Amino acid sequence: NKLFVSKEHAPYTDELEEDVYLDPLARVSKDKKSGSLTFNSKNIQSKDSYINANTIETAKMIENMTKEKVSNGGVGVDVELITSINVENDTFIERNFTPQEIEYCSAQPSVQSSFAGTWSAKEAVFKSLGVALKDIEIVRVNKNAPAVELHGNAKKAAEEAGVTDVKVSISHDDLQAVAVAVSTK
Amino acid sequence: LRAAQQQWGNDFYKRDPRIAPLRGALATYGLTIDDLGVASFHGTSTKANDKNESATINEMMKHLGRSEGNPVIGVFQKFLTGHPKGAAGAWMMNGAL
Amino acid sequence: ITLFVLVSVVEAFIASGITDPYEMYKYVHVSEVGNCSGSGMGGVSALRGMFKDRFKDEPVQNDILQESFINTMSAWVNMLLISSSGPIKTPVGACAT
Amino acid sequence: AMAATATDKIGRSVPAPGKGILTTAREHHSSVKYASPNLNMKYRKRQL
Amino acid sequence: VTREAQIKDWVENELEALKLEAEEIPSEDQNEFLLERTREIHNEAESQ
Numbered sequence: 001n002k003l004f005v006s007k008e009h010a011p012y013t014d015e016l017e018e019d020v021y022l023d024p025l026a027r028v029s030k031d032k033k034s035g036s037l038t039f040n041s042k043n044i045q046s047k048d049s050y051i052n053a054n055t056i057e058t059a060k061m062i063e064n065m066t067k068e069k070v071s072n073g074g075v076g077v078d079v080e081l082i083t084s085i086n087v088e089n090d091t092f093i094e095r096n097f098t099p100q101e102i103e104y105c106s107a108q109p110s111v112q113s114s115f116a117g118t119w120s121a122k123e124a125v126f127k128s129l130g131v132a133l134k135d136i137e138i139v140r141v142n143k144n145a146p147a148v149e150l151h152g153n154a155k156k157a158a159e160e161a162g163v164t165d166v167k168v169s170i171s172h173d174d175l176q177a178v179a180v181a182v183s184t185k
Numbered sequence: 186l187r188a189a190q191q192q193w194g195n196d197f198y199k200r201d202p203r204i205a206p207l208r209g210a211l212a213t214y215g216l217t218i219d220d221l222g223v224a225s226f227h228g229t230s231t232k233a234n235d236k237n238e239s240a241t242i243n244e245m246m247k248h249l250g251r252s253e254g255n256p257v258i259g260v261f262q263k264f265l266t267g268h269p270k271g272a273a274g275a276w277m278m279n280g281a282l
Numbered sequence: 283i284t285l286f287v288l289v290s291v292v293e294a295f296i297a298s299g300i301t302d303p304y305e306m307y308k309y310v311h312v313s314e315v316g317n318c319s320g321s322g323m324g325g326v327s328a329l330r331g332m333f334k335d336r337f338k339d340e341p342v343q344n345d346i347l348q349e350s351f352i353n354t355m356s357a358w359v360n361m362l363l364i365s366s367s368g369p370i371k372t373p374v375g376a377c378a379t
Numbered sequence: 380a381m382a383a384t385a386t387d388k389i390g391r392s393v394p395a396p397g398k399g400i401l402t403t404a405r406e407h408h409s410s411v412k413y414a415s416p417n418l419n420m421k422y423r424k425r426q427l
Numbered sequence: 428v429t430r431e432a433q434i435k436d437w438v439e440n441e442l443e444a445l446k447l448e449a450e451e452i453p454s455e456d457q458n459e460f461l462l463e464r465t466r467e468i469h470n471e472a473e474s475q
Contacts, residue, residue, distance in 0.1 A: 367399035
């Protein structure tokens, strides 16, 4: 006879009420002691609520694109809205991605976001060289910086411009994939 | 065109947690929080009401960085009309206009 | 009537797999949970209290009037269960409420 | 320019006014070192 | 799909414009500036 359980307390204390009302990003969390869902002062007007992992990654990527951080080399920036990637489109996936890239992206939690991350990397590299994207392979290891490897006509095109190294950074989330490629001679 | 005007003109702040609904509403016309000159208060002449309402308006203004020295001017129409329950806001809105 | 609502609301939350309504506040702001439910006639037993029982000098709780209001059922829901600061738009639409 | 409604919180006093309408001023202030271009009508007009 | 191509371009342009703006920001304050402005571009891309 307890389907209905009246709340004794709001999820906030009287002291936090106004703070909760005034922060649109305030969320409850499990209180370790009570086990109940409450607002904790640490999650009210907290930077972590607003500045997420994708924001931190993307800001770092374009911080490593400022003239003082790195200059004297081809810089390519690509963004892909992940909704643009049809992972069922076997034609587009087989044409533009290597079996290693397809295996890596398929194994990730969001396949679509990972493919968008890889497509954005390939297109950012192509823009950095300045000359199908299967020629440009992105080798991705978990919590490690991705590596660029030029195989077919992309390798020849890089040799023409005297490109020694190509490095790429990738951020991707539920909305967009951003890739910054720096090609150095 | 209307959707673009809605995105940039009317609804630019709806997805922006750094813009309060109150601030966005005024910023649509190029007004700031300092341009809210008058607050028509519910102002019912009850102990609880008039304090809570003042505290609420005051907290809204503080949170949105209303300039020190720029209080909203309170209007309390019910001194004259009394409290007509459901019509209360409508008389206040007419006053406001 | 308020007891029918309180039961229906908890049961609707159970049918949504939400057994603690405060779980909503892991996902949304307290401003973002609304109640738009209504009634055609509201707390008609409370109306009887104030129009008939009071006239016959029968014992009637001093705050009977508040329990009559069509929006009081939603207030109790918020006060007992939900604790939102979201919209509250109580329609009255007779048979189409 | 704006109209909003707001309930309050857990309680036992139907007549008691509350502070829920304070939510109309809600604004996240963790990161406010720089002005948002979104608040600048010239920026918005350029985008349009 | 045509509009999504335009939004992708809009984000590329805003990131390029943001990099140029960030070059004129002193190096210690550049992190906070890019965090605020990057989160804002994300909001505007989602809205679009």
